[PDB]
């Protein structure tokens, strides 16, 4: 027997730019395919159409490469179970409201540059003793980073956020803001007030209106919506 599943996938070729974006259907026999959508994507490329193009690297949902929109929601292809209902066609799109390089590959360079702009690295007031001894951090203080440092920077959350759709040029977005929070609450970091002062404008932080698509969509189970609410509380109460 065979269990033929249909995938409708977004196509666009920059070397044939005049061919408008379209959807292409592929039939995949699930009895000869791994259980995840990435498995089906690699099988299609290896057996059915080697022009199909997508980013991927790891396989266990840790690298963040294969983020895309599957069945209407942003997620990692490599950890998204194929839906075995053969009467339903699974639609696959690039991450939403992004510039398409080709097929399922979006341009993430603004996303990365927004991440760079928040200075995601440890800053102490005196760094001249770096390299000499372990900084001390209590178990309790370290525990505050749980739920924040696990982010794989896949951009599923930001590209699910309507405010980031309309104002992604100025709104840093949930992924970057949660990383900003991760450095704010690190007990070893000395630049909390400055990290907060950076957000004192109408857009960087304050385009968030608590829509909460970001938390619903995170494939790592994280909660950037809550992280953003904690910044807002710090913003409203920090002195000078």
């Amino acid at each position: 027997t065979s269990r033929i599943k249909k995938f409708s996938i977004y196509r666009w070729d920059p070397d044939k730019p005049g061919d408008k974006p379209r959807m292409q259907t592929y039939e995949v026999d699930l009895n000869k395919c791994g259980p995840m959508v990435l498995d089906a994507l690699i099988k299609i490329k290896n057996e059915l159409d080697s022009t199909l193009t997508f980013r991927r690297s790891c396989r266990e949902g840790i690298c963040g490469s294969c983020a895309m929109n599957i069945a209407g929601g942003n997620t990692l292809a490599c950890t998204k179970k194929i839906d075995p209902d053969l009467s339903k066609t699974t639609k696959i799109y690039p991450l939403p409201h992004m510039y398409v390089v080709k097929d399922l590959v979006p341009d993430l360079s603004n996303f990365y540059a927004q991440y760079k702009s928040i200075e995601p690295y440890l800053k102490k007031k005196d760094e001249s003793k770096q390299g000499k001894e372990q900084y001390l951090q209590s178990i309790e203080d370290r525990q505050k980073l749980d739920g924040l440092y696990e982010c794989i920077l896949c951009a599923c959350c930001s590209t699910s956020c309507p405010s980031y759709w309309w104002n992604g040029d100025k709104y840093l977005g949930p992924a970057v803001l949660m990383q900003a929070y991760r450095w704010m609450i690190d007990s070893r970091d000395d630049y909390t007030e400055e990290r907060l002062a950076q957000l004192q404008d109408p857009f960087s932080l304050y385009r968030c209106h608590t829509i909460m698509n970001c938390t619903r969509t995170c494939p790592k189970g994280l909660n950037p919506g809550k992280a953003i609410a904690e910044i807002k509380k710090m913003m409203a109460t920090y002195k000078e």
Binding site: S163, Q200, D201, P202, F203, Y206, R207, K232, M235
Partner: protein, 101 residues
């Protein structure tokens, strides 16, 4: 320096005030509530539509135009409410008369 967070804080404060004025209008109608509702409704509404503008309107000139028009609407709106409060029955009694239909 802290203008953005201060505005965010003020918005929440006015939202809470509006909340407190609902029960107040039922228990203590009259001039004090009537004019406080006029002020809190106008300011809560002005800032709210301001958020809508910031989200959706882009471009230097479109933004300036949109915000100028909002100021006009807010000013006319607060003027009518005060005018209605002063020369007419007022917001509290207007709502009670409407609900007597």
């Amino acid at each position: 320096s802290k203008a953005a967070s201060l505005h965010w804080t003020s918005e929440r404060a006015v939202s809470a005030l509006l909340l407190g004025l609902l029960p107040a209008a039922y228990l203590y109608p009259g001039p004090a509530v009537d004019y406080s509702l006029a002020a809190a409704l106008t300011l809560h509404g002005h800032w709210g539509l301001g958020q809508v503008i910031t989200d959706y309107v882009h471009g230097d000139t479109p933004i300036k135009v949109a915000n100028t028009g909002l100021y006009v609407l807010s000013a006319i709106t607060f003027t009518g409410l005060c005018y209605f409060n002063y020369y007419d029955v007022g917001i509290c009694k207007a709502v009670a008369m409407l609900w007597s239909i």
